[PDB]
Amino acid sequence: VDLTEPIISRFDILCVVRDTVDPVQDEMLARFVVGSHVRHHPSTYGVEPLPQEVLKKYIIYAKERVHPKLNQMDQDKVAKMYSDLRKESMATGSIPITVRHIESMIRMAE
């Protein structure tokens, strides 16, 4: 990645995307891309999305009218998870700096 630990560890979520070849998945992706191109002419989902206007209203409502509280999250489970996550990371190449990943999990639960 060429980034350092102080800047990597500040990112709560790390995402890796790879354009590896898989002909069935390539067929599905290409059919969807062509479908988007013909759909949006000027003129893995399986659930259907919300309309984007509804999503904007939903987000702006949820960020102000809702404030999730934390009262119990199975403390020993998270602590054990974080500890052996640190153990495995010590042998390999990504960096769960001590509290930032714990707090990342708390933030993601919220």
Binding site: D74, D76, K77, K80, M81
Partner: protein
């Protein structure tokens, strides 16, 4: 000073050579007198140095004997200066063991100037083993030292025996009919039965009016140290321990752990959910 060590070898070679194969009784009784005399701490004549020398050399000899099993297809389950356990083929146990036992014993003796004093073949024809702390097998023998630490209240000991024996019997039936995958079948059968059994012992033991505290329910042996508290949980833990070690296919056992700990409403990853050996074994 090494001449004394070589003279001990000379004396031992003398008495064992004096077996005088027409007959001897003194030489035999005193060859075994070496065996007890280099063990007994009441022995004298700069004794701890000689006991230490025996142990340090016998470590290398025993390691040679156990290690050189490698060249013939075989697996070792247990090894002690007296007791050893081996496996080579899934059929015709005596003929299967004959080639490895006699070839290895002979070449043990040739390489080590003598090691041919071996005996074998006593009834362990199908065995799940972790020493008499934990074993079970069909010749159905059950020897689980941890079972003694479960209470007899609500028949928890009997239910341990029931689940373990049923699992062994079902897998053994599959093996005999074949003569791996049946692990999953018995796992589903246990997914039903283990649920029912945990409910049975839970409702019966919690309703027992003689319980001043459920910690008082447990038996105490000289190895007992744990704060055993909630018999269905200890039963689950011990059963799942043996089930998680008698197959590498632990996935359904782990699922049973999750399901039954949630059925007891006690959390996984907690200290109380972790297995610990109920016995402070001391030798």
């Amino acid at each position: 000073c090494s001449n004394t060590f070589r003279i001990l070898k000379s004396m031992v070679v003398g008495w064992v050579k004096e077996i005088t194969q027409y007959h001897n009784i003194y030489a035999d009784n005193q060859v075994m007198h070496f065996y007890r005399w280099l063990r007994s701490p009441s022995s004298l004549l700069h004794d701890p140095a000689l006991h230490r020398t025996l142990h340090n050399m016998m470590k290398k000899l025993f390691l040679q004997l156990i290690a050189e099993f490698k060249r013939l297809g075989s697996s070792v389950i247990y090894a002690n200066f007296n007791r050893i356990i081996l496996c080579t083929k899934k059929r015709r146990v005596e003929d299967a063991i004959a080639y490895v036992e006699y070839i290895t014993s002979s070449i043990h003796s040739k390489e080590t100037f003598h090691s041919l004093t071996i005996s074998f073949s006593r009834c362990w024809e199908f065995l799940l083993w972790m020493d008499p702390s934990n074993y079970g097998g069909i010749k159905l023998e059950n020897n689980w030292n941890i079972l003694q630490f479960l209470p007899q209240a609500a028949s928890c000991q009997n239910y341990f025996l029931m689940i373990v024996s049923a699992y062994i019997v079902a897998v053994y039936h599959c093996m005999k009919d074949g003569l791996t995958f049946s692990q999953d079948y018995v796992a589903n059968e246990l997914t039903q039965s283990f649920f029912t059994i945990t409910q049975k012992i839970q409702k019966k033991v919690t309703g027992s009016r003689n319980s001043t505290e459920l910690s008082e329910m447990f038996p105490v042996l000289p190895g007992s140290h744990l704060l055993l508290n909630n018999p269905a949980l200890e039963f689950i833990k011990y059963v799942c321990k043996v089930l998680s070690l008698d197959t590498n296919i632990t996935n359904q056992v782990n699922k049973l752990n999750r399901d039954l700990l949630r059925l007891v409403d006690v959390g996984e990853f907690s200290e109380e959910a972790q297995f610990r050996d109920p016995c402070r074994s001391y030798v």
